[PDB]
Amino acid sequence: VIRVYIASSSGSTAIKKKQQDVLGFLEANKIGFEEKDIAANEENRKWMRENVPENSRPATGYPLPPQIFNESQYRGDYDAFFEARENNAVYAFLGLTAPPGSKEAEVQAKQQALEHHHHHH
Numbered sequence: 600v601i602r603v604y605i606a607s608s609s610g611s612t613a614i615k616k617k618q619q620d621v622l623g624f625l626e627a628n629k630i631g632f633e634e635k636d637i638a639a640n641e642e643n644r645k646w647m648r649e650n651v652p653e654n655s656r657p658a659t660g661y662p663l664p665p666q667i668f669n670e671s672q673y674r675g676d677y678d679a680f681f682e683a684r685e686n687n688a689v690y691a692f693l694g695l696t697a698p699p700g701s702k703e704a705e706v707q708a709k710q711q712a713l714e715h716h717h718h719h720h
Contacts, residue, residue: 601633604635604636605635606636606637635647650668650673651676663676674692688703691707
């Protein structure tokens with residue numbers, strides 16, 4: 600399942616909206632997910648902060664929610680999610696197989712078919 604770490608009592612309206620954006624997208628696309636609130640749960644808060652890789656931790660304070668993981672594996676922050684959706688490559692971003700019928704899956708299918716034909720003699 601995709602774990603989305605959020606802060607329900609974030610001091611920023613922008614953060615609240617970014618979290619709802621991610622949660623709503625997962626729901627809409629029927630992607631199995633669960634929210635992990637760090638606002639009032641020390642385990643969730645500490646876990647998120649430690650499991651966000653160094654290269655995704657801002658130079659100021661702590662990494663900001665939402666932070667997205669596939670089970671315990673880090674996938675990315677809101678910016679990474681935002682870009683993945685702009686490129687219609689959200690499933691790859693989440694470390695999930697793009698569903699048969701989805702544009703992402705078709706695009707992936709065509710790309711692999713081409714790379715195979717080039718490899719093929």
